[PDB]
Amino acid sequence: QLFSKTPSVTVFDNRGLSVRDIAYRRHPDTPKVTEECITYHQFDFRGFLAQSLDPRLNHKEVTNFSYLTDLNGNIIYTQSVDAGNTLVLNDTEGRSVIAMTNISRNGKDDLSLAVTRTFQYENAPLPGRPLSVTEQVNGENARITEHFVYAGNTPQEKNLNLAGQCVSYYDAAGLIQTDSVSLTGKPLSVSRKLLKNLDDTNILADWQGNDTSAWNSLLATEIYTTVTRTDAAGAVLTTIDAVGNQQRVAFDIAGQLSASWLTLKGGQEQVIIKVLTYSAAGQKLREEGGNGVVTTYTYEAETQRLIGIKTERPNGHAAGAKVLQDLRYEYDPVGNVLSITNDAPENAYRYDSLYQLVSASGREVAGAGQQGSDLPSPLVPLPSDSSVYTNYTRTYTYDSAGNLMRIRHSAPATNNNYTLNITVSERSNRGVMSSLTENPADVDALFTASGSQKCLQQGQSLIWTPRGELRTVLLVARGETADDSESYRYDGSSQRILKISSQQTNHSARVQRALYLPGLEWRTMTGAEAENLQVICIGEAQVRVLHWESGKPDGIINDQIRWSYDNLTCSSGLEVDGDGLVISMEEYYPYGGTAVWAARSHIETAYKTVRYSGKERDATGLYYYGFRYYQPWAGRWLSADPAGTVDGLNLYRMVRNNPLRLTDPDGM
Numbered sequence: 001q002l003f004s005k006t007p008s009v010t011v012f013d014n015r016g017l018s019v020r021d022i023a024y025r026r027h028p029d030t031p032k033v034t035e036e037c038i039t040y041h042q043f044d045f046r047g048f049l050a051q052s053l054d055p056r057l058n059h060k061e062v063t064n065f066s067y068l069t070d071l072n073g074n075i076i077y078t079q080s081v082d083a084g085n086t087l088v089l090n091d092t093e094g095r096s097v098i099a100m101t102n103i104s105r106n107g108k109d110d111l112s113l114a115v116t117r118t119f120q121y122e123n124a125p126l127p128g129r130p131l132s133v134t135e136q137v138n139g140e141n142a143r144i145t146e147h148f149v150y151a152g153n154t155p156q157e158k159n160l161n162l163a164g165q166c167v168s169y170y171d172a173a174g175l176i177q178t179d180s181v182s183l184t185g186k187p188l189s190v191s192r193k194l195l196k197n198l199d200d201t202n203i204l205a206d207w208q209g210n211d212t213s214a215w216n217s218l219l220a221t222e223i224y225t226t227v228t229r230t231d232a233a234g235a236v237l238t239t240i241d242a243v244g245n246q247q248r249v250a251f252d253i254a255g256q257l258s259a260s261w262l263t264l265k266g267g268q269e270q271v272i273i274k275v276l277t278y279s280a281a282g283q284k285l286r287e288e289g290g291n292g293v294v295t296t297y298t299y300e301a302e303t304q305r306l307i308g309i310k311t312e313r314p315n316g317h318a319a320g321a322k323v324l325q326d327l328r329y330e331y332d333p334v335g336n337v338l339s340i341t342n343d344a345p346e347n348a349y350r351y352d353s354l355y356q357l358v359s360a361s362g363r364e365v366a367g368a369g370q371q372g373s374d375l376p377s378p379l380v381p382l383p384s385d386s387s388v389y390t391n392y393t394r395t396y397t398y399d400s401a402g403n404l405m406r407i408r409h410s411a412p413a414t415n416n417n418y419t420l421n422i423t424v425s426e427r428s429n430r431g432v433m434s435s436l437t438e439n440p441a442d443v444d445a446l447f448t449a450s451g452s453q454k455c456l457q458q459g460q461s462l463i464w465t466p467r468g469e470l471r472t473v474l475l476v477a478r479g480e481t482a483d484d485s486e487s488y489r490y491d492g493s494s495q496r497i498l499k500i501s502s503q504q505t506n507h508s509a510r511v512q513r514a515l516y517l518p519g520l521e522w523r524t525m526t527g528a529e530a531e532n533l534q535v536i537c538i539g540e541a542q543v544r545v546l547h548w549e550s551g552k553p554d555g556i557i558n559d560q561i562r563w564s565y566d567n568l569t570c571s572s573g574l575e576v577d578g579d580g581l582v583i584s585m586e587e588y589y590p591y592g593g594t595a596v597w598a599a600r601s602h603i604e605t606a607y608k609t610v611r612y613s614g615k616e617r618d619a620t621g622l623y624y625y626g627f628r629y630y631q632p633w634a635g636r637w638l639s640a641d642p643a644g645t646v647d648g649l650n651l652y653r654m655v656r657n658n659p660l661r662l663t664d665p666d667g668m
Contacts, residue, residue, distance in 0.1 A: 570614020
């Protein structure tokens with residue numbers, strides 16, 4: 001038990017201010033050596049943060065961070081070699097007048113990319129809410145990103161409970177008409193207008209022109225709506241989803257879910273749950289899926305730590321009686337996972353005293369080779385025999401400041417071995433796969449002023465756009481042909497409302513067009529008999545359904561329904577159908593490369609994308625997490641979180657050196 005004498009300590013000035021802090025570190029590879037890691041917080045004449053720094057740049061005697069404020073209050077201006085700079089101002093009332101971003105590290109930082117946001121308001125008598133805000137592009141095409149309409153107090157509005165409501169919010173990707181409300185405060189309805197053609201990347205959803213006499217040129221015919229009724233407690237009583245779906249739900253006395261039903265598009269509504277039951281801790285205890293497979297849950301009653309979860313098929317079931325899993329987990333006193341096992345057999349881990357997970361070992365499938373920018377083939381059919389997977393060691397290395405060095409692996413019986421470097425800046429968190437460059441001075445040129453990265457791969461440029469928005473990646477195409485298109489639409493709250501890719505290389509010119517709305521995705525491979533389908537969100541460990549409109553598959557039914565099983569990260573190792581037949585097994589390294597993959601039907605590569613950490617695969621092999629996108633072979637964000645330093649010093653860092661750490665689904 002290595003951990004003896006690895007405390008942490010915080011230190012203060014005579015004003016009691018948090019001048020310094022210390023963490024002791026010790027690799028189990030280095031059991032005789034204890035590192036002391038420290039950083040500083042200088043404070044000003046105001047009694048507020050003057051300076052705080054990266055440990056390693058600091059002890060290399062370089063200064064790389066800044067924070068500047070009003071007379072008291074809050075930061076006006078703030079820079080890092082990582083973040084770039086940032087400036088804001090707000091009212092006496094805290095209403096915002098201006099914000100700017102993506103400003104470089106020279107006399108002054110580069111304002112030409114400032115991507116300025118500024119705001120327009122309700123005025124007397126109205127309470128003073130913004131009626132609009134605009135992207136005031138510096139020296140360039142300034143454009144009104146959004147517009148708010150606030151209701152009056154007509155009897156109509158009162159009945160709709162829209163009195164004073166933001167009855168419109170025009171926005172990037174279009175408008176929500178906040179178009180009726182219940183007296184509980186929950187909506188009676190909302191209408192969404194997407195753009196006149198949401199396909200058209202250059203109809204900007206910027207509200208030039210004075211009113212929708214103009215803006216009709218920018219809003220769709222394909223307008224959709226949700227309608228809702230609720231508990232006095234506000235929980236949903238029923239709902240309607242204008243493409244043809246609809247909702248009903250029922251609950252236990254504490255408000256826990258008993259049962260639910262959803263209308264499929266233009267058709268029947270049917271029961272989801274067969275059994276659902278919970279612990280005294282309120283957490284789940286005993287369940288049975290709509291296919292009829294049975295689950296139960298197991299906890300340490302002293303602590304409510306989940307020690308395991310078990311699932312089986314009942315007698316005479318369509319897929320036959322079988323234990324499907326019996327997950328068991330091993331923990332240290334703090335609760336870090338030491339090992340796991342399952343039967344339907346084992347894996348194990350090592351940590352630094354600082355709880356960097358330095359090593360992992362277990363089974364991974366042979367022949368997939370060294371993980372790159374790729375997803376290798378499933379084993380097909382589902383392996384009847386186990387030797388196709390084999391022992392591995394996987395290991396990792398890190399800085400005393402918040403940076404990694406290398407990743408290091410063997411699956412020795414496969415002869416698959418590597419050690420692979422993230423080159424990281426001599427003076428920042430900016431860093432890339434060795435393939436892009438091996439040089440830590442040169443690497444810092446590969447990034448924007450915000451510190452967003454230039455490329456996915458040797459030429460795979462990242463189309464960062466105003467409001468820090470990665471509209472597309474170039475991918476690769478022969479002759480650079482746009483027929484293999486890619487792009488995404490983002491709404492005013494960055495919702496990935498549309499996929500707009502395409503393919504035509506040696507194939508039908510199908511646009512991969514897909515739409516993303518509450519409870520809904522619609523996909524078409526169009527522009528051959530076009531593929532056309534919808535999928536609908538079955539709850540919230542969620543459940544998933546399909547219906548083709550067109551493009552019938554071989555040997556597969558339409559209207560198909562599936563449940564799934566995951567590890568606690570929602571790493572979605574398992575999927576199962578309405579007959580209780582498993583679709584396939586899958587698994588991931590902690591770094592998120594797939595450890596095992598198989599299929600019972602070949603094109604399963606498209607059928608499931610909620611996978612590693614329950615995050616969403618892009619078919620290229622990236623994972624979309626929520627706000628942001630991830631490079632699994634690099635084990636790192638392909639993106640920056642600049643939203644707050646108190647959340648962490650490194651914008652690209654994942655999960656405090658253990659991606660397995662938490663249940664947390666957030667993904668920003």
